[PDB]
Structures are given as structure tokens and as C-alpha cells.
Curated annotation (Swiss-Prot):
It comes from Notechis scutatus scutatus (Mainland tiger snake). Disulfide bonds join 11-71, 27-118, 29-45, 44-99, 51-92, 60-85, 78-90. The active site is at 48, 93. One of its GO terms (biological process) is arachidonate secretion. Binds 1 Ca(2+) ion. Ca(2+) binds at residues 28, 30, 32, 49. Monomer. This is Basic phospholipase A2 notexin.
Length: 119
């Protein structure tokens, strides 16, 4: 999951910020998953969790291999067609990489008290 997701995030945001900046943000960007998303970047992470829960109920995890993608001028896009579970997880990852690149990064929402703000 994380290695290829990091390449898609870095492609979409052009290098603006390191992937780790999105790993402990709000209520949903990171390990847990409770409460209401604190902002539009946090809503990106919640949709990505919904997407990964759907992929798991379709038997798409663990990943058979690396999915196919290309980083063009355009930003990243997925290229698997015949391998359906690899295309489904890549779609989840590239929609969150674009969402992240377009959402404002609110520095006050990095590493919050999640037991309190999301519960």
C-alpha cells in the first residue's frame, strides 16, 4: 500500500511536501478513523479509508503485486485494466493523491489530540 501510494502523492503534489506530512493529520489521515473529518484534507483520508474497506471486501488485499501507474505532466494515472484488484486499489490511491494535492494543508490540524477532537 504505502510505497506506491507515496509515489502517487509525490506525483500529484509535485514534491510540495513529504508524504509523512499526511500520515498524522486530523482524525482520519493516519491510523485511527473516528469522528467527523476536521477539514477537506481529512475528508480526503476518510474517503480513502472507505475505498480501502471496499477493496478488502472485494478480496483485493494484500496486494498481489505492484499496480501499474504513470506519472505524466498531468499528474498520476492508473494503467491496469485486466488485473481488476490492482486497478481498484490504484484508483483509491490516485483519487486520494489528487484530493491531497488540492486540499489546503492546515498546519494546526497536524498531529492533533485525536482522543479529544475526534471523540
Amino acid at each position: 500500500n504505502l510505497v506506491q501510494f507515496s509515489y502517487l502523492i509525490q506525483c500529484a503534489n509535485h514534491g510540495k511536501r513529504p508524504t509523512w506530512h499526511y500520515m498524522d493529520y486530523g482524525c482520519y489521515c493516519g491510523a485511527g478513523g473516528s469522528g467527523t473529518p476536521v477539514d477537506e484534507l481529512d475528508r480526503c483520508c476518510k474517503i480513502h479509508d472507505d475505498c480501502y474497506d471496499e477493496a478488502g471486501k472485494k478480496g483485493c488485499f494484500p496486494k498481489m503485486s505492484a499496480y501499474d501507474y504513470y506519472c505524466g505532466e498531468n499528474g498520476p494515472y492508473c494503467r491496469n485494466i485486466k488485473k481488476k484488484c490492482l486497478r481498484f486499489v490504484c484508483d483509491c490511491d490516485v483519487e486520494a493523491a489528487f484530493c491531497f494535492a488540492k486540499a489546503p494543508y492546515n498546519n494546526a490540524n497536524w498531529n492533533i489530540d485525536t482522543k479529544k477532537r475526534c471523540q
